[PDB]
Structure 1
Amino acid sequence: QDNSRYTHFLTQHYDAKPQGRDDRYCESIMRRRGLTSPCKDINTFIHGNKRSIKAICENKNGNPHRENLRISKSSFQVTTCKLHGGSPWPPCQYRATAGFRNVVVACENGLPVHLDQSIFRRP
């Protein structure tokens, strides 16, 4: 158990320096990150440095948000990959949306351990 929740976050939600944040980017990193296991219908990767993600947990770069979450004060480059086919089983075709926005995470012992995906469900 111990700490393994943060490195799950970093594996599902952090990509430090991506190159083109396109449909093909979504498809290779979703498959490189295990998230095609069944096909995750939507998932967002945060870019930039870990230091800035991790500080959302402190009042340096964090604000309290709803019940038990935190929302960042600074904005992050983000890429949301969306399933675009109706079936959960491979092949997993993903559509990409690059964005720049602040992020809502959950913190545990001063470490991000959950990303709230609802703010990236844009209609």
Structure 2
Amino acid sequence: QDNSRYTHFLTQHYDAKPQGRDDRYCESIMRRRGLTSPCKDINTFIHGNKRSIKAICENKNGNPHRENLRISKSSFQVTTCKLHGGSPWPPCQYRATAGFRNVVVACENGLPVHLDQSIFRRP
């Protein structure tokens, strides 16, 4: 009842109710969640109900996806922070992109423990 990989998932990818989701929101939340030594190149946060995110692991809000993933049926408010400049070391400058769409995760014993970042890269 806690599973370290799940709570770590929340730490790296969940923010219940953010305010303004601008560049500065990124720079501050990344630092606050310890994702800046080195600077993560890209990281997305999901906003909203924790309950709904957990339900992606049952069929109630999830569908199998690719080899071993699950994709949500419902859409979520998300914010993607993309590292700016060319250095893995702080100060880490981030550019924010707010979005709204379904998300892809990996589950374990009923809980999300991985977020697939590829669907958020806009190459």
Q: TM-score, normalised by structure 2?
A: 0.98
What is the DSSP-based 3-state SS (H/G/I as helix, E as strand, rest coil) of the residue aligned with 1:52? Answer: helix
What is the DSSP-based 3-state SS (H/G/I as helix, E as strand, rest coil) of the residue aligned with 2:24? Answer: helix
Q: Following TM superposition, where does structure 1 have runs of at least 4 consecutive aligned residues deviating by more than 6 angstroms?
A: none
Q: Partners in 2 of 1:70 and 1:21 — Cα distance? A: 26
- 1:69 corresponds to which residue? 69
The sequence identity of aligned pairs, in percent, is 100
Shift of residue 122, structure 1, vs aligned partner: 1.1
Q: Partners in 1 of 2:18 and 2:79 — Cα distance? A: 9
Shift of residue 2, structure 1, vs aligned partner: 6.9
Q: CA offsets, 1:66-101, max 9 Å, x none? A: 111000000000000000011000100000000000
Q: CA offsets, 1:8-49, max 9 Å, x none? A: 000000000000000000000000000002000000000001
- 2:55 corresponds to which residue? 55
Once superposed, what is the RMSD of the aligned Cα atoms?
Answer: 1.2
Q: Partners in 2 of 1:2 and 1:51 — Cα distance? A: 15
Q: How many pairs are equivalent?
A: 123
- 1:13 corresponds to which residue? 13
- 1:103 corresponds to which residue? 103
Q: Partners in 2 of 1:64 and 1:12 — Cα distance? A: 23
Give the gaps of 5 or more residues in structure 1. none
Q: TM-score, normalised by structure 1?
A: 0.98
Q: Partners in 2 of 1:36 and 1:3 — Cα distance? A: 24
Q: Partners in 1 of 2:36 and 2:50 — Cα distance? A: 24
Q: Partners in 1 of 2:41 and 2:62 — Cα distance? A: 28
Q: Partners in 1 of 2:86 and 2:49 — Cα distance? A: 34
Give the gaps of 5 or more residues in structure 2. none
